[PDB]
Each structure stands twice: as C-alpha cells, then as structure tokens.
RNA sequence: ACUGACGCUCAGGUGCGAAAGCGUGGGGAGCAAACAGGAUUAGAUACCCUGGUAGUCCACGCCGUAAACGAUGUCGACUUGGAGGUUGUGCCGGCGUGGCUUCCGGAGCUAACGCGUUAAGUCGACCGCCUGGGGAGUACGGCCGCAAGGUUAAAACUCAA
RNA sequence: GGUAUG
Ligand SMILES: C[C@H]1O[C@H](O[C@H]2[C@H](O)[C@@H](O)[C@@H](O)[C@H](O)[C@@H]2O)[C@@H](N)C[C@@H]1NC(=N)C(=O)O
Ligand SMILES: [K+]
Ligand SMILES: [K+]
Ligand SMILES: [K+]
Ligand SMILES: [K+]
Ligand SMILES: [K+]
Ligand SMILES: [Mg+2]
Ligand SMILES: [Mg+2]
Ligand SMILES: [Mg+2]
Ligand SMILES: [Mg+2]
Ligand SMILES: [Mg+2]
Ligand SMILES: [Mg+2]
Ligand SMILES: [Mg+2]
Ligand SMILES: [Mg+2]
C-alpha cells in the first residue's frame with residue numbers, strides 16, 4: 658500500500674539527463690553568449706551537457722577553427738563543469754565534448 | 760589600357776555579410792575584400808581560414824578583390 | 830387634426846465609447862497573463878500537462894483605444910427585376926399597402942474583384958480625409974492622463990520602387 | 991505524437 662511514498666522517495670532525487678547544445682565554427686559572439694547562458698542553466702540544475710560542433714562542407718578543412726570554439730566553451734565553463742570527454746578527431750562531421758557538473 | 764593591380768596572397772580572418780571578407784595579407788595589413796565576379800558565378804565558396812589571392816589597388820590599400828582561392 | 834421651412838450639414842466644442850489597464854474599497858466559484866512545477870526538443874524563455882496570482886465580478890473615479898469593419902461620413906431625390914425573412918396595416922386563404930432586413934441579379938459603374946433601389950448607379954448639400962515606400966503615427970512642441978499612455982504631428986536620410 | 995537541413 659505504502660509504495661506511493663517509496664516511489665516518491667526514489668523520484669525526489671533526479672535522474673541526470675544530457676542536454677545538447679550545438680555550435681558551428683562561425684557562431685557569432687552574441688549567439689555564443691545565448692548558448693553559454695543555456696549551458697550555465699543546464700549545469701547549475703545538475704544536467705550533463707553534450708556540446709557538439711558541426712562542420713559543414715569544406716569547413717572540415719579548417720578543423721582547428723572549430724576546436725577553438727570548444728576550447729573557448731571549456732574555459733568559460735571551467736568553474737562549474739568538468740570535461741567528461743574532449744573530441745580528438747572529427748567523427749562524421751561533428752566534435753562532441755561532454756561536460757558534466759562539478 | 761588599365762593600370763596594373765598588385766596581386767598579394769592572404770588568409771581570410773572573418774566572413775562578413777554578402778561575400779565580404781577580412782583578409783590578412785602577407786605584409787600583415789588586414790584588407791576588407793570582396794569576391795570576384797568569376798568566382799561568384801562559378802560558385803567558388805570562400806571560408807574563414809582559406810588561402811586567397813587578393814588583387815589590390817594603390818588608390819585604396821584597405822580594399823581588395825579576392826581573385827583565387829587555393 | 831395641428832404648427833408653418835421651424836430644414837440639411839457641421840471646423841472648433843460637448844458627450845458616449847469593446848477589451849486590456851489604472852486608483853480607492855469590496856468580492857472571489859469558474860477561468861487565467863505573470864509565475865511554479867512536469868514534459869516535448871538540438872534548444873523550447875512556447876505550443877501540451879498540473880497548478881496558480883493579478884485580472885475577469887461589484888461600487889465609484891480614471892483611461893479613450895481596437896480588423897471600434899460594411900475596412901463604405903451624414904442628409905435628400907431619382908433609376909429595370911427575382912427569391913426570402915421580419916414587423917405593422919387595409920380589403921375580400923387571396924388581393925394590396927408601409928417600416929426594417931438577407932440573398933441573387935439587370936442597366937450603369939468599377940483596374941478588377943465586385944457593387945447593383947439598403948449602390949460602389951444617376952445627381953445635389955455640407956463635413957472628414959489622401960498625395961511613392963521605408964524612416965513613422967516616430968521625434969520635437971502643445972494639450973490630456975495618477976500611470977500606462979493617448980491626441981495633434983514633422984524632417985534629415987535611404988530605396989526605385 | 992514536431993515533415994530541423996536537397
Ligand atoms: C512543427 C514545427 O513547425 C514549424 O517548423 C517547420 C519545420 O519543422 C519544418 O517542417 C519546415 O522547416 C517547415 O517549413 C517549418 O514550418 C514551426 N512552427 C516550429 C514547429 N516545431 C516545434 N514547435 C517544435 O519542434 O517544438
Ligand atoms: K451650426
Ligand atoms: K485568483
Ligand atoms: K475579368
Ligand atoms: K521619401
Ligand atoms: K508628445
Ligand atoms: Mg474592464
Ligand atoms: Mg481594479
Ligand atoms: Mg487552471
Ligand atoms: Mg495552463
Ligand atoms: Mg485608430
Ligand atoms: Mg462586423
Ligand atoms: Mg477606418
Ligand atoms: Mg448631424
């Protein structure tokens with residue numbers, strides 16, 4: 658009968674979901690700031706943050722311009738998140754850095 | 760009969776609206792360049808990072824026409 | 830039966846004016862901006878779900894705006910028809926005769942769509958308004974407002990729509 | 991149940 662409150666006591670600690678924010682090589686400053694405010698909000702709630710960077714076409718041939726962005730995000734989210742994964746290579750046409758709450 | 764253009768080599772720093780580009784030249788001056796007509800019509804895409812030939816004018820050394828992408 | 834042109838229109842003026850909103854005080858079921866949470870999602874400051882405050886209601890006072898629309902100013906006259914609705918009335922269910930109103934259509938009008946005796950037809954009276962797009966119903970000034978704002982209302986500039 | 995992008 659009293660499973661009702663047991664189920665509640667289970668649910669009262671949240672399951673960590675993974676929120677995805679997707680950048681591009683040429684994401685401009687103001688738009689970057691919006692996405693960063695998104696990530697700050699996600700990590701302060703205790704959610705993981707699968708940050709992706711999608712290359713398109715011949716932007717593939719300038720990988721480091723992308724890598725710069727992911728490095729920038731890591732640095733900005735340094736006193737808040739910890740890098741659970743950093744991309745070495747372009748897998749497909751993407752580079753996935755998982756952050757996670759401290 | 761036209762006066763001669765300085766062709767200089769350079770790297771695209773930013774893509775601006777409407778096929779305009781900041782380009783750092785070899786000499787180190789950052790010109791605002793625009794795509795050539797031939798390139799526009801032949802769909803040669805220019806990106807941040809790309810190596811480009813820039814035709815320049817002595818009349819204004821802040822401006823140039825991107826004529827080739829390597 | 831009576832009055833005997835006493836009329837029509839109206840800048841300024843005065844009033845009325847959906848909802849939201851504002852002030853003071855009531856009231857508060859339902860609903861519900863904001864908000865809280867649950868989801869959905871690449872993100873989802875939404876749509877969906879659970880709630881939920883102002884508000885919605887009343888009194889008094891304010892506000893004065895809406896696709897406040899027929900996107901059609903008011904008054905009068907004239908100009909083929911058809912089918913209805915609604916509300917009087919006269920006469921012998923029928924035959925008239927008024928008011929309001931819905932739809933179709935003729936001439937005519939219209940860029941066309943369409944309008945078409947309830948005209949966007951044919952005329953007359955008076956008023957309001959327009960003069961390329963954006964800038965802008967914005968700025969400045971005035972007036973009004975507790976405030977939100979409202980009203981009156983430009984220009985530079987830029988475009989070749 | 992949202993048919994993001996040839
Ligand atoms: C269902 C989505 O519909 C609308 O977005 C459509 C988009 O999803 C594509 O099907 C095409 O680009 C269409 O041309 C767009 O109209 C747009 N209103 C956003 C909606 N999506 C969401 N609300 C959602 O995914 O969530
Ligand atoms: K008068
Ligand atoms: K309430
Ligand atoms: K026609
Ligand atoms: K003009
Ligand atoms: K004013
Ligand atoms: Mg009200
Ligand atoms: Mg009140
Ligand atoms: Mg409710
Ligand atoms: Mg709701
Ligand atoms: Mg108005
Ligand atoms: Mg109406
Ligand atoms: Mg009007
Ligand atoms: Mg009058």
Ligand SMILES: [Mg+2]
Nearest residue numbers: 933934944945
């Ligand atoms: Mg008709």
Ligand SMILES: [Mg+2]
Nearest residue numbers: 938939944949
């Ligand atoms: Mg007309």
Ligand SMILES: [Mg+2]
Nearest residue numbers: 966967979980
């Ligand atoms: Mg104003």
